[PDB]
Structure 1
Amino acid sequence: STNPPPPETSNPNKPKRQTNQLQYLLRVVLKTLWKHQFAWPFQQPVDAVKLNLPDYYKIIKTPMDMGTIKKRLENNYYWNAQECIQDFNTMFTNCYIYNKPGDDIVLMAEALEKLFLQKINELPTEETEIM
């Protein structure tokens, strides 16, 4: 068709780790985002073939979505919280560079992003490890 396989969520070489900030991201930030009115387009990888998105994978070199992010959180895939935050920003900016400003999907991403920036500002200022 063809869609690339979902992004990796497990790191054999890359070391596993957990912090109170990654914990807050999973148990609070992502839980709030997941039930937003506009979460559903971002809950799984973009099926660009079924959606007939021309050149989507030529233009979007790093596909990203909240289902991948959630599983990476559940797999301690991230070293720290800022790494998780980068995947969220990649998901939002993917949508902004691919679509006309002000389109429906862009409005949905913008509203999710606005909620996301609000919740990540509740993150503990100090990072502390977890077993």
Structure 2
Amino acid sequence: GSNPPPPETSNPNKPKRQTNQLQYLLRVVLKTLWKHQFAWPFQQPVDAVKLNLPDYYKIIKTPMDMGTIKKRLENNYYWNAQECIQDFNTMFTNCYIYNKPGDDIVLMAEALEKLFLQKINELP
């Protein structure tokens, strides 16, 4: 079991720009999630080798994490806030797909997702 290559964080020919919503996504939303107690499992791509999860990438084909998101935001990878939001949704959804209701990790995802949804209500 090897790890796949992580998701891209820059792409010359993918349309990209800066928006004040995307700035907020970085400065406020991502920063709040990043510093939360429960951030740690979601700060980097799932290392299926070191975490001993050899079925992870059998089940999850569209992986996403906050390390990847942070870098995409810092590089202005996105065209709009909706693309970034979709990456967050993918992250949480993957957690819920791979794991089971009530699992420690699922409860952490849920608390981060509540907090995410609260912060994207205040999107300018």
Question: Which range, TM-score by smaller chain?
Answer: over 0.9
The answer for the alignment partner of 1:15 in structure 2 is 15
Distance 1:98 1:14 in 2: 29
What's the CA shift string for 1:47-105, capped at 9, x where partnerless?
11222224211210111000000000011100100000000000000000111110000
What's the TM-score, normalizing by structure 1?
A: 0.92
Aligned residues: 124
The answer for the alignment partner of 2:98 in structure 1 is 98
Distance 1:15 1:108 in 2: 33
Report SS of the residue matched to 1:38. Answer: helix
Report SS of the residue matched to 1:7. Answer: coil
What's the CA shift string for 1:80-131, capped at 9, x where partnerless?
000000000000000001111100000011011110000011101xxxxxxx
RMSD (Å) for aligned C-alpha atoms: 0.8
Distance 1:10 1:77 in 2: 6
Distance 2:45 2:98 in 1: 15
Gaps of 5+ in 2: none
What's the CA shift string for 1:9-41, capped at 9, x where partnerless?
001111220101000000110011100010011
% identity of equivalent residues: 98
Distance 1:16 1:44 in 2: 23
